[PDB]
Amino acid sequence: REEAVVWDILDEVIREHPVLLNRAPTLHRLGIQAFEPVLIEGKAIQLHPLV
Amino acid sequence: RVTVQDAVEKIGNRFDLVLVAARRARQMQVGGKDPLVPEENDKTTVIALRE
Amino acid sequence: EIKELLKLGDLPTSGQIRLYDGRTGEQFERPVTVGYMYMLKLNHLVDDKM
Amino acid sequence: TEFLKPRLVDIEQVSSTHAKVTLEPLERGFGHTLGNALRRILLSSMPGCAVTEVEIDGVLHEYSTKEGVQEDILEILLNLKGLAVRVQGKDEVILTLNKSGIGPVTAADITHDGDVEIVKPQHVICHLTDENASISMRIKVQRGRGYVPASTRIHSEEDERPIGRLLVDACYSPVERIAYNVEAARVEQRTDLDKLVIEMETNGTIDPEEAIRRAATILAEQLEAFVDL
Amino acid sequence: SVTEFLKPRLVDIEQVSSTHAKVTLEPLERGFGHTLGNALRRILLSSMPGCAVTEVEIDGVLHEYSTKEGVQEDILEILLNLKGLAVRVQGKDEVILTLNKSGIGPVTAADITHDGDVEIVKPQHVICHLTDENASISMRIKVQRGRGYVPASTGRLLVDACYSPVERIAYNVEAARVEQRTDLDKLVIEMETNGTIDPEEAIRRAATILAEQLEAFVD
Amino acid sequence: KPLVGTGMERAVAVDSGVTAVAKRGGVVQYVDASRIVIKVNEDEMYPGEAGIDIYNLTKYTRSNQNTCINQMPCVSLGEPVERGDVLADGPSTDLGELAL
Amino acid sequence: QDVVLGLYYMTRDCVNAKGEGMVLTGPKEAERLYRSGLASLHARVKVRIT
Amino acid sequence: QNQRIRIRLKAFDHRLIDQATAEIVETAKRTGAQVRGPIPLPTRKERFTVLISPHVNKDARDQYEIRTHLRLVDIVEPTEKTVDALMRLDLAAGVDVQISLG
């Protein structure tokens, strides 16, 4: 039902759970990295510019 | 804090640092221990690191 | 001949215009290119992939 | 401490849609500071009035077509989205429309009221193209502010609308572009008094003599939190 | 809804120093974080009124070009260092103060002839260092009331005036959210100020300056 | 329409067969965004025929790639048309120029 | 690439500029000087530094 | 200068007659009329008393009422835009309108 509480719960679940992002192919160790997520309204994954 | 900066000095074996961080977090998660540091409603993994 | 057309319009023949930033109304330093490119939406739109 | 305060000395409704307004005098910088603040407020936050639903007699969904009319029903909705009207002391109203016989259909055909006023009678809804052809429809208008896409709106209504309504995306904000400009003017035999000019293009529902004060009001009350700290 | 836009509360004074603070507001409507953050910035950095050092007369000099001996740093630096002195003037347009000191060692603004009509709000501000057994210096420092920051464009030594007490102000806008949308703005204002006024109140002064413009339009 | 093109649009949009193209010259008899129907002139009619070319346009339909393809008229009632004029736009066209 | 473009532009010296050649007590009033539009960003200056 | 033209609004619920009143007076104001009203003309309260049982027991009876409220709204000043507007615009069905010309 996506009720109004669930986001305040989600923003507690995730509050510091690292998630692993990797492209493919992934030639070298730097090609999988972990980041702390922060929530977004859209549908794209917002990545950091330098990385 | 977001990373193990001082614990890297504590545990020069480096892998031992994951194994001790998980040991301490098992004291909290399964041994029922609670940490001393003054939280303000936050997820505890960054506290498990500190040992 | 592009310059000649831009002169027939009342437009600046440098093609560039000074712009301001709507976050402050400050001017940008040096003019910037402004004009009517043609842009295509491609069939790789995201909700079809998320 | 020597601050001259502004008054809104002059206005020029150059067209039924476009106008200029001027605020005079101002000190150092305040020509820019208000000049941009009011532009940014006028674009975001002027309330206005939009079509929001349309029910047409024999249609079922946006993608259909009506016999004897020049537009797909969809392009009728793309046309009505641009229609703009005043409403007098109401949060919403329903407009009926009827036409028959060949030729254009235009906003002048809406069943007029004292309490609704339309900015441009010639804005065109479709063509009729057959001798017996007709359309009748119930355009619903709502007040509001900003922009509200129908996809979120029906997700905000939470009852299930009937078959045979059409929904349109809401675009209330009545000002299409705003420009500001600053210059020195004759007051008190002195320099660096800015005549701010703000000049504006609109959908035609509002007059600057309201608009700039309403924008200044919004600013003045948002700013309360910073003096109430 | 139609005229009841969301209003912030201060989420914190977030204070890290008496000199600098990070006053943060939440929520603001989308885009207002600039419309107020920068508007108050442009007020704060350039149109706040206040009092500052404006001219100097050290004993017997025509131009800070002349590097008179007995002082460690030359007169170009004493001239800017005296711009560094924050001052409060009560009720007057321009006021001259006198300073002198003697003996080998530093000089400080505490050594000024403190009128009490004027407050030197940071006495411990070092002015220079003295460099001979006979070292002493005496000078007139003019302080003046004015507004903003005015450059050296306009025996006296002229100097830029720092009438606005804001040493720096900066602001950001950032994502904030409610139970059903995240397109709203947070606003962070950070500012640092010379000690004449505390920042959480300087901003209340500035918000007033801005409010006073609107007083002729607000209904 | 693209504002800057190459003048090849006037050919891709017609030859690709997706705009509906007037098979014979005449005058528009009726239009309604579903049908367009042309009173062909007797200089190009065949003698026993009624002399009337309908074009039932394809409306909203899936392309093989699921994009829609609704044809729309470009003509007006009573307007003259000549053999090979575009009567109805395709997808991605207007007035018979390609317009992606 | 854009970050380095910005830092290049910020740190050039242009031999003519607004506010060129004055002497400042620190970065903060350097910034006040820039932001108020009193000095151009690549203008030459002397500053006290630490 | 047509004489004063008056309208009778009759309704069962009073709120709907008041919405109709608001509509009419807003109309005649925006089209510039010397609006005079809305005179509240007396509620006709009709009563009925019917037996409840489908048989004997006369003493168990229900009594209902119907309240017909009137608003008399006068427009002394017609400027023919009022004429068009009034003759054009209708309302909901819980309100019935009747116009006296002069």
Swiss-Prot record, chain A:
Tell me which domain of life the UniProt entry assigns to the organism this sequence originates from. Bacteria
Q: What does this protein do?
A: DNA-dependent RNA polymerase catalyzes the transcription of DNA into RNA using the four ribonucleoside triphosphates as substrates.
Q: What family classification does the UniProt entry report for this protein?
A: Belongs to the RNA polymerase beta' chain family.
- Description of how the protein assembles with itself and partners: The RNAP catalytic core consists of 2 alpha, 1 beta, 1 beta' and 1 omega subunit. When a sigma factor is associated with the core the holoenzyme is formed, which can initiate transcription.
Name of this protein: DNA-directed RNA polymerase subunit beta'
This chain's source organism reads: Escherichia coli O157:H7
UniProtKB/Swiss-Prot annotation, chain B:
GO terms classed as biological process? bacterial-type flagellum assembly; bacterial-type flagellum-dependent cell motility; cell motility; cellular response to cell envelope stress; DNA-templated transcription initiation; intracellular iron ion homeostasis; nitrate assimilation; protein-containing complex assembly
What UniProt keywords apply to this chain's record, in alphabetical order? Answer: DNA-directed RNA polymerase, Nucleotidyltransferase, Transcription, Transferase
Q: What class of enzyme is it?
A: transferase
Gene Ontology MF terms in the entry: bacterial-type RNA polymerase core enzyme binding; DNA binding; DNA-directed RNA polymerase activity
Q: Does the keyword Transcription apply?
A: yes
Q: Which GO terms describe its cellular component?
A: cytosol; cytosolic DNA-directed RNA polymerase complex; RNA polymerase complex; transcription elongation factor complex
UniProt keyword Thylakoid, yes or no: no
Q: Which reaction does it catalyse?
A: RNA(n) + a ribonucleoside 5'-triphosphate = RNA(n+1) + diphosphate
**EC numbers:** 2.7.7.6
Family the entry assigns: Belongs to the RNA polymerase subunit omega family.
Role, per record: Promotes RNA polymerase (RNAP) assembly. Latches the N- and C-terminal regions of the beta' subunit thereby facilitating its interaction with the beta and alpha subunits.
Q: What name appears for this protein in its UniProt entry?
A: DNA-directed RNA polymerase subunit omega
Highest classification ranks of the organism? Bacteria, Pseudomonadati, Pseudomonadota, Gammaproteobacteria, Enterobacterales
Q: Which residues of the full protein are shown?
A: 3 to 53 of 91
UniProtKB/Swiss-Prot annotation, chain E:
Region annotated Alpha N-terminal domain (alpha-NTD), chain positions? 1-219
A Gene Ontology biological process in which this protein takes part is:
DNA-templated transcription initiation
What are its GO cellular component terms? Answer: cytoplasm; cytosol; cytosolic DNA-directed RNA polymerase complex; membrane; transcription elongation factor complex
List the transmembrane segments.
none
Keyword Transport listed: no
Post-translational changes noted in the entry: (Microbial infection) ADP-ribosylated on both alpha subunits by the phage T4 protein ModA. ADP-ribosylated on only one of the alpha subunits by the phage T4 protein Alt.
Q: Which UniProt keywords apply?
A: Acetylation, ADP-ribosylation, DNA-directed RNA polymerase, Nucleotidyltransferase, Transcription, Transferase
Can you state which reaction this protein catalyses?
Answer: RNA(n) + a ribonucleoside 5'-triphosphate = RNA(n+1) + diphosphate
A single GO molecular function term of this UniProt record: protein dimerization activity
User: E.C. number, please?
Assistant: 2.7.7.6
Comment block on domains? The N-terminal domain is essential for RNAP assembly and basal transcription, whereas the C-terminal domain is involved in interaction with transcriptional regulators (such as CRP) and with upstream promoter elements.
What family name appears in the similarity comment?
Belongs to the RNA polymerase alpha chain family.
Recorded protein name is: DNA-directed RNA polymerase subunit alpha
Which residues of the full-length protein are shown here? 4 to 233 of 329
UniProtKB/Swiss-Prot annotation, chain H:
Citing just one GO molecular function, the answer is: transcription antitermination factor activity, RNA binding
User: This protein is called what?
Assistant: Small ribosomal subunit protein uS10
**What family is it from?**
Belongs to the universal ribosomal protein uS10 family.
Q: Which Gene3D superfamilies match?
A: Ribosomal protein S10 domain
Residue ranges that the Swiss-Prot or TrEMBL entry lists as coiled coil:
none
Q: Which NCBIfam families match?
A: PRK00596.1 (NF001861), rpsJ_bact (TIGR01049)
Q: Which UniProt keywords apply?
A: Ribonucleoprotein, Ribosomal protein, Ribosome biogenesis, RNA-binding, Transcription, Transcription antitermination, Transcription regulation
* Protein species of origin: Escherichia coli (strain K12)
Ribonucleoprotein as a keyword of this entry, yes or no, is yes
User: What are the boundaries of the signal sequence?
Assistant: none
Q: Give the record's subunit note.
A: Part of the 30S ribosomal subunit. Can also form a heterodimer with the transcription antitermination protein NusB. Binding of S10 to NusB is mutually exclusive with its incorporation into the ribosome. The rRNA transcription and antitermination complex (rrnTAC) consists of RNAP, NusA, NusB, NusE (this protein), NusG, SubB, ribosomal protein S4, DNA and precursor rRNA; S4 is more flexible than other subunits.
Q: Which GO terms describe its biological process?
A: cytoplasmic translation; regulation of DNA-templated transcription elongation; ribosome biogenesis; transcription antitermination
Q: One GO CC annotation, please?
A: small ribosomal subunit
